[PDB]
Write an enzyme that holds these catalytic residues in place. Structure first.
Site, mmCIF file in Angstrom:
data_model
loop_
_atom_site.group_PDB
_atom_site.id
_atom_site.type_symbol
_atom_site.label_atom_id
_atom_site.label_comp_id
_atom_site.label_asym_id
_atom_site.label_seq_id
_atom_site.Cartn_x
_atom_site.Cartn_y
_atom_site.Cartn_z
ATOM 1 C CB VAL A 1 3.366 2.351 4.130
ATOM 2 C CG1 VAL A 1 4.255 3.310 3.385
ATOM 3 C CG2 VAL A 1 2.634 3.040 5.279
ATOM 4 N N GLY B 1 -5.674 -2.049 5.456
ATOM 5 C CA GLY B 1 -6.438 -3.039 6.180
ATOM 6 C C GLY B 1 -7.920 -2.887 5.907
ATOM 7 N NE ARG C 1 -8.071 3.239 1.421
ATOM 8 C CZ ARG C 1 -8.922 4.255 1.487
ATOM 9 N NH1 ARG C 1 -8.493 5.451 1.872
ATOM 10 N NH2 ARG C 1 -10.196 4.080 1.160
ATOM 11 C CE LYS D 1 -3.023 3.642 12.769
ATOM 12 N NZ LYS D 1 -2.795 2.383 13.540
ATOM 13 C CG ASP E 1 -4.750 -6.712 16.165
ATOM 14 O OD1 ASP E 1 -4.425 -5.922 15.246
ATOM 15 O OD2 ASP E 1 -4.969 -7.940 15.982
HETATM 16 C C1 LIG Z 1 6.218 1.199 7.188
HETATM 17 C C2 LIG Z 1 6.497 2.031 8.459
HETATM 18 N N1 LIG Z 1 5.287 2.283 9.271
HETATM 19 C C3 LIG Z 1 5.330 3.191 10.345
HETATM 20 O O1 LIG Z 1 6.257 3.923 10.594
HETATM 21 C C4 LIG Z 1 4.051 3.026 11.085
HETATM 22 C C5 LIG Z 1 3.550 3.700 12.180
HETATM 23 C C6 LIG Z 1 2.304 3.305 12.668
HETATM 24 C C7 LIG Z 1 1.590 2.269 12.066
HETATM 25 C C8 LIG Z 1 0.256 1.828 12.585
HETATM 26 O O2 LIG Z 1 -0.312 0.883 11.998
HETATM 27 O O3 LIG Z 1 -0.207 2.421 13.578
HETATM 28 C C9 LIG Z 1 2.113 1.599 10.964
HETATM 29 C C10 LIG Z 1 3.340 2.004 10.491
HETATM 30 C C11 LIG Z 1 4.128 1.487 9.344
HETATM 31 O O4 LIG Z 1 3.855 0.557 8.623
HETATM 32 C C12 LIG Z 1 7.611 1.341 9.251
HETATM 33 C C13 LIG Z 1 8.904 1.311 8.446
HETATM 34 C C14 LIG Z 1 9.293 2.647 7.897
HETATM 35 O O5 LIG Z 1 10.435 2.926 7.576
HETATM 36 N N2 LIG Z 1 8.288 3.582 7.759
HETATM 37 C C15 LIG Z 1 6.940 3.372 7.948
HETATM 38 O O6 LIG Z 1 6.136 4.246 7.690
#
Ligand SMILES: C[C@@]1(N2C(=O)c3ccc(C(=O)O)cc3C2=O)CCC(=O)NC1=O
Lengths: 232, 176
Positions: free
Chosen positions: A22, A25, A29, A43, A145
């Site tokens: 999802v 970077g 990932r 993560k 950030d």
């Molecule tokens: C795409 C989404 N999601 C997170 O929940 C999330 C939690 C932590 C991080 C992080 O960078 O620390 C990134 C994310 C991320 O992109 C949001 C929308 C959704 O419906 N589900 C997801 O998984």
């Protein structure tokens, strides 16, 4: 120990084999999945074959360690942010709650400015952002950030429920120069990604300064960081 | 009188089984046997468990450090209990989250890996109690003391469940 650790990173890789990717970077990932029956997101701060595995070792650990304490610090403070379920320090993976059905503030602002056609509609969102970062900074927690893609909007969208994410570069400091530089990078994030949203950055700033009790010195150091370009 | 068993998602070779008992009479004898090793599993205070997720997260972190040989305690069955505490005081953790001599309801957690199974009918046989199904766990759990022993907040309940605030100090206490 040297053999068992290779095994623990080997389960990791297997586990993430069948998961949807999802976010990707330079350092991390983010895979989407389920963890013991809960909607979770994992993560991984992956190693790159490009540099000395001694330096890369600590770089994954620090980001993960720093994100783990930062999300604890926000949960105990009423700052909304993902819950952390498990932190694997062998593989630098971070199992946290998925923020289901959310959209980033960045796409909430290039979706509201293609239909409303004016930034006049974004002052409520700016108001709440000022309130969210004020109570964060009021516990001397520097995000590290701040961008409009590390803030999510939890459903229902109408009430503007902001969830902050991505704390790998975060750190504790009461120094106004550090809170000032923290707001400066969010300011430059608006400039690069969201054109003509300058009026939106004080609905933020004016909100921040009426929501955080120590904001006056931080906005003197913001205007000093804007003049210099960095902290010094 | 039904078990609840769940498979560990990162270690699918393992499973976690939860058994809950009411009206226990030999909790004191039961504790000595855990220190003595006669009985298999972890004997946990059910008064402070808000959801099986609390047990599985603890189970998961315990197997993980077990398999790396860097557990903070001695037995796997004692590392499970410790990982439930919000502090790192090992002895305080096992008095307050284990079972004590005059308790009447106890929760048994045990992990079996692969083919090796536990004699679950010999395990129940050692408890002078009425095994109830884990659906009965909410009526045993006391929030007044979940909040006391976890030191939950004003602010913490405002942004999520109390299970989330618990999970999120269980899982970060190893980094202060
Ligand atoms: C795409 C989404 N999601 C997170 O929940 C999330 C939690 C932590 C991080 C992080 O960078 O620390 C990134 C994310 C991320 O992109 C949001 C929308 C959704 O419906 N589900 C997801 O998984």
């Amino acid at each position: 120990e040297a053999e068992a650790l290779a095994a623990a990173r080997e389960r990791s890789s297997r586990f993430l084999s069948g998961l949807e990717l999802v976010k990707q970077g330079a350092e991390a990932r983010v895979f989407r999945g389920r963890f013991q029956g809960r909607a979770a997101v994992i993560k991984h701060r992956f190693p790159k074959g490009y540099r000395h595995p001694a330096l890369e070792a600590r770089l994954g650990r620090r980001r993960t360690v720093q994100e783990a304490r930062a999300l604890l610090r926000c949960r105990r403070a009423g700052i909304s942010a993902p819950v952390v379920f498990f932190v694997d320090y062998a593989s630098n993976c971070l199992y946290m709650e998925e923020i289901e059905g959310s959209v980033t503030v960045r796409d909430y602002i290039q979706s509201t400015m293609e239909t409303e056609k004016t930034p006049q509609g974004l002052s409520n969102l700016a108001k709440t952002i000022g309130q969210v970062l004020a109570r964060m900074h009021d516990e001397d927690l520097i995000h590290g950030d701040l961008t409009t893609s590390n803030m999510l909007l939890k459903p229902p969208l109408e009430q503007l429920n902001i969830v902050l994410i991505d704390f790998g570069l975060s750190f504790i400091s009461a120094l106004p120069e550090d809170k000032g530089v923290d707001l400066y990078v969010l300011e430059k994030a608006f400039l690069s990604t969201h054109p003509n949203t300058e009026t939106v950055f004080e609905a933020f700033l004016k909100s921040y300064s009426t929501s955080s009790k120590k904001a006056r010195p931080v906005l003197k150091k913001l205007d000093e960081v804007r003049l210099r370009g960095r902290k010094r | 009188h039904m078990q609840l068993t769940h498979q560990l998602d990162l270690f699918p070779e393992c499973r976690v089984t939860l058994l809950l008992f009411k009206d226990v009479k030999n909790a004191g004898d039961l504790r000595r046997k855990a220190m003595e090793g006669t009985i298999d599993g972890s004997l946990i205070n059910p008064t402070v468990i808000v959801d099986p997720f609390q047990i599985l997260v603890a189970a998961n972190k315990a197997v993980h450090l077990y398999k790396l040989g860097k557990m903070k305690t001695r037995t796997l069955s004692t590392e499970i209990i410790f990982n439930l505490s919000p502090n790192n005081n090992i002895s305080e953790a096992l008095k307050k989250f284990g079972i004590s001599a005059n308790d009447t309801s106890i929760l048994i957690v045990y992990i079996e890996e692969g083919e090796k199974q536990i004699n679950q009918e010999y395990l129940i046989s050692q408890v002078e109690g009425h095994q109830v199904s884990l659906k009965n766990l909410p009526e045993i759990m006391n929030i007044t003391e979940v909040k006391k022993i976890y030191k939950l907040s004003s602010q913490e309940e405002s942004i999520g469940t109390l299970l989330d605030a618990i999970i999120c100090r269980m899982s970060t206490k190893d980094v202060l």
